[PDB]
């Protein structure tokens, strides 16, 4: 069992899933409305969104309080966030600007990937070695979508039997997608293209928000019960409360290097020869050059205007 990193509005916490009865440790305190959270393990970085400050920040683990603002403008409700630990990128969703965007880890070179046909985008998850990103939208037409990490080839993968898809996560070892629906009261799983869908957990989910996974176990936060719960990812059996009496549990991850599998960065040492952004791509050579928003990529496919 892993450490679980979770956002908690006024702070970010870490609880040992193996001992959820003890006090959680406060990794970062003095926050206003911390919602989304992720990390880059090899870099010793933890990122979070704050929906009242309208910002994304980061710190260095156990070398705090060296906290920095990384995205400060053009955000209103940054409800979801994911770190590309391979391409070294930051992705996020905003349910009020209706946008999915990407930037470097330091916030530079920001690029709007999608800004249309988004209503209530929420959770976002990345498969950097496959060049895909996945997100949920709990709006008027609820759905789960995926697209290239370079913003290519957007497609809807789930759009039936869905209402409030709040949590989303990936199993890198088994190539499976998992999500939590807070209105329909279940957790489901499917192939990464959404096919071969199956029920996992079918009750006791009054208000799941965020979902993660480690080894044979799913972990999630529930807004109603103010706790973290777990079950078996194959059978949905062994439903149990891991950690209780949480002030306001939010986004959550299994905090482990093993949850960010190593691979070769297709961008290589020289940023793939891109002048600005080198983004993971699902198509060979598995990276794609890109430019900050508004600026056009030239004919050579590598240099921005």
């Amino acid at each position, epitope marked *: 069992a892993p450490l679980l990193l979770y956002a908690n509005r*006024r702070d970010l916490r870490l609880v040992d899933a193996t001992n959820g009865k003890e006090n959680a440790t406060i990794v970062v305190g003095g926050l*206003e*409305d911390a*919602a989304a959270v992720d990390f880059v393990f090899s870099h010793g970085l933890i990122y979070w969104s704050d*929906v*009242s400050e309208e910002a994304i920040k980061r710190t260095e683990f156990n070398k705090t309080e060296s906290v920095q603002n990384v995205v400060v403008s053009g955000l209103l*409700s940054p*409800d979801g966030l994911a770190c590309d630990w391979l391409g070294e990128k930051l992705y996020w969703t905003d*349910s009020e600007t209706n946008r999915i965007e990407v930037s470097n880890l330091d916030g530079s070179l920001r690029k709007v990937l999608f800004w249309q046909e988004l209503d209530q985008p929420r959770a976002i998850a990345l498969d950097p070695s496959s060049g895909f990103m996945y997100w949920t939208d*709990w709006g008027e037409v609820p759905k789960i979508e995926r697209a290239g990490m370079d913003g290519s080839s957007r497609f809807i993968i789930i759009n039936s039997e869905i209402y*409030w898809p*709040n949590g989303l996560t990936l199993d890198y070892e088994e190539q499976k997608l998992y999500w939590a629906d*807070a*209105k329909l*009261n279940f957790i489901h799983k499917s192939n990464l293209d959404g096919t071969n869908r199956q029920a996992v957990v079918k009750g006791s989910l*009054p*208000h799941p928000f965020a979902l993660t996974l480690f080894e044979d176990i799913l972990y999630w936060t529930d807004w*109603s019960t103010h706790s973290i719960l777990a079950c078996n990812k194959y059978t949905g059996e062994g439903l149990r409360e891991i950690h209780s009496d949480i*002030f*306001s549990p*939010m986004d959550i991850h299994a905090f482990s290097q093993q949850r960010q599998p190593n691979a070769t960065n297709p961008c290589g040492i020289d940023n793939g020869g891109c002048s600005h952004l080198c983004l993971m791509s699902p198509v060979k050579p598995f990276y794609q050059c890109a430019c900050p928003t508004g600026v056009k990529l030239l004919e050579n496919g590598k240099t921005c205007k």
Partner: antibody
Amino acid sequence: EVQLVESGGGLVQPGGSLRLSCAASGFTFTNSYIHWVRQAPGKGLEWVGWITPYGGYTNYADSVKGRFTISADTSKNTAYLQMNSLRAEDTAVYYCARGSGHVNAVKNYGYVMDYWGQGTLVTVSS
Amino acid sequence: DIQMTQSPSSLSASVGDRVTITCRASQDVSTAVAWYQQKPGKAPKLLIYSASFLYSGVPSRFSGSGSGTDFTLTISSLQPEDFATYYCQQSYTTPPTFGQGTKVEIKR
């Protein structure tokens, strides 16, 4: 426009029960918190509890926990306050009020009460 | 429970006067504070939430400020129709709790 209409208030003997209703219209019932708040004659406002009709989850004030419960019939867009073992001190005007914003939103205004019913008077007396 | 303490519990001021009502929380509730106006025999009406956000349709003379534990309601220019009891409330966590209220009378 948003509307909340309370009914069922009345004279009731101590130790008795009474069910109040809150009929809602003009907004999506299942997207909201619905609160009950009471005010004794000449006194302040006291939150009694809330329900989120989508699944029927509730929270209650310590003062009424064990005696009062809240339920909702989404087919009728109506919430109910079931009051048991009534005491003289329960005498008050009971309001139902809607929380602001969407129950599923991250920026949560669910405890900000933006629309209130007219209230219904409950008198616990012999 | 978070105790919300208003002061003063009542006041009288003249039309055109600037009036200040304070609300103090026993814990840090960030900016999760709302203000309501209650006229006699009527339900409370929301004036302000998130400490400083003026609710649609509410007169500009009403404003709220504050953060953490100390919050203020200001009426910049008191009007005769402002006779009421005003309540602060934390919307920060369960249970929602209200201040004891401040009765405002018009001095003429």
